[model samples]
Target chain A: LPSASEEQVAQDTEEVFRSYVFYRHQQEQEAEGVAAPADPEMVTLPLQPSSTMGQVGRQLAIIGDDINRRYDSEFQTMLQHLQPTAENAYEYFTKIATSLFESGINWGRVVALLGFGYRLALHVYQHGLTGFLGQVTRFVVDFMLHHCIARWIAQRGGWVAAL
Target chain B: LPSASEEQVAQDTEEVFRSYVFYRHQQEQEAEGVAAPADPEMVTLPLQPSSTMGQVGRQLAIIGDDINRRYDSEFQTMLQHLQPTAENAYEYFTKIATSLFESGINWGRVVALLGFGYRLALHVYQHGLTGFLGQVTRFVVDFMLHHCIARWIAQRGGWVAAL
Candidate 1:
């Protein structure tokens, strides 16, 4: 199932919810518990930045994407009203990134932010990243900016990383 | 299953969910629409403690008992070291009673506090209250103390009772 929003999540009592932490822990636990080594490509969700430290940042990103998809109709309306040109898309998704970070930020957050970035960038291209790198750069830059600032603030503020 | 204890609560991500707010509001709307007296399912789970707070407290005391039961053998072994007695039981429970409010007391919290007292009192009456109002007075004192003190402080201090 897609991820729940903050309000929905607050009231959610469904045990074993893959809200964010559960999915990551499940993957790690499954990997640790298994006896035979599995093929690297076959049976695992990609870890964030394809690295270990980026674990939390990745989970928050997925949760954000899930929320975006769940409210896609509303989001589409918002995007249409805003006109998701590269300039507009950057500003719009910067809010999603910012709101999630106001609670605190993590790099894996890009997973979701960049997912939004990727889609907005891809929507423009409808082609390959090779062809779309120019369009993608605007998104990438915003993604990096949001991630870096949030991370710096979180580090200095001593607020918790996103749960 | 019977209600579980705090330890068991930890075991399961033990849920303590509130009834839905919309459902609660719907009850209010229905109450307004009703032409006559109502059975009152609208304010069912409790909007905030008051007359409806007894159940949660009773649950906590019973939960403590259940956790102890699972490891009764170990408890007995430890008890032998400590040499529990009727005097100790009374004293132990009294300490438990007073520990809930340490800094000060609140009169408004009395009703909700009564819930815990009721549950603790109920557990104390394992053999039952019966013709034992005098013996049950231990519980009565605890309940009465919480009730009186809770209300007095609440009336004097307002929101401080919540603390």
Candidate 2:
């Protein structure tokens, strides 16, 4: 498939970021309400899975945990460089995407980058840098679109491409 | 290791939900700002990974896609029964956790349930049933903690257990 142009890449990345933001907003608003009572009616007797199914669960957990361990420290190191300023947001995001892209961009790394961005966003927000939140989202989306994924998307035949 | 008490389970679940809500709120607030420019400074040439690394990417994509295909329809089916009210939210969440638990709960299913909750929260928010967001989050946490995972947690000897 022909590569996607930079314009197409930007549009796609923006849409994804926007959609996530919208969902995330709803999630926050919902979480602000009162906690439900720990009523007994809400409880149930848990059942044990068959050995085979349990094995599958164990394997899946292993894969997920391994992935987390492999990259979490890198995320911490990246965090040390994170500054809650508009300019730093842009540069920080660009650097992250560039670093990941340089290491061999894959779907897993793409997901990791977003997860890291979410962490950084949370940190900034909690630190009372609310004004920078918008800029951070923009920086992430922009960096991924322009500096990271345009060529990859093109190589894979645009957003219509599988996975 | 001994299983966690009901009180311990509730506390742990509450903490997880609270932490997620905090992070998600920050993410939402960040997305509310103006779009960044499509300026040239943001653009960079994407590099291709080596054939071996590219193959790994393709495989990971395949696994992720397969998982999505397997569960998305189930989520849609669950969605059809969702109602934007506190009572219905409770029932709907209970049913989902029960369904997944019956299928032999795993870390993957747990993640899938959270993803589904996020989608439902977004839908309700977009539909102006914003008041139900809190209830929905509450229901999900309650159902998972009390119904789906209490025994599992016990079996694994609390959250300290390996993934």
Give the candidate number with the greatest lDDT.
2
Worst-scoring 10-residue span by lDDT in model 1 chain B:
B11-20
How far out, in Å, is residue B127 in model 2?
Answer: 37
**Per-residue lDDT tens digits of candidate 2, residues A1-163?**
3466766665555444433333333343455534421212112212223333233223333333346445655675657656554335545666766777786767556545655565566555544444334444445665665464756755666544523
- Clashing pairs in model 1, backbone N/Cα/C closer than 3 A: A57-A108, A57-A109, A58-A108, A61-A112, A101-A104, B106-B150, B107-B150, B107-B151, B107-B154
DockQ of each: 0.01, 0.01
Model 1, residue A33: what's the lDDT?
A: 75
Predicted model with the maximum TM-score: 2
Candidate 2: stretches off by over 4 Å: A1-5, A21-81, A160-163, B1-163
Candidate 1 docking quality: incorrect, acceptable, medium or high = incorrect
**Residue-level lDDT tens digits of model 1 in A1-163:** 3334332322221111112323433444465777522222212322344332244444553555444454433443444444423334446666765665576554444344444443444343332112222333333443443245433523433112344
TM-score of each: 0.24, 0.34
Q: Candidate 1 lDDT (Cα, whole model)?
A: 0.35
lDDT of 1 at A56: 40
What is the Cα-based TM-score of model 2? 0.34
Error (Å) of candidate 2 at residue B115 is 46
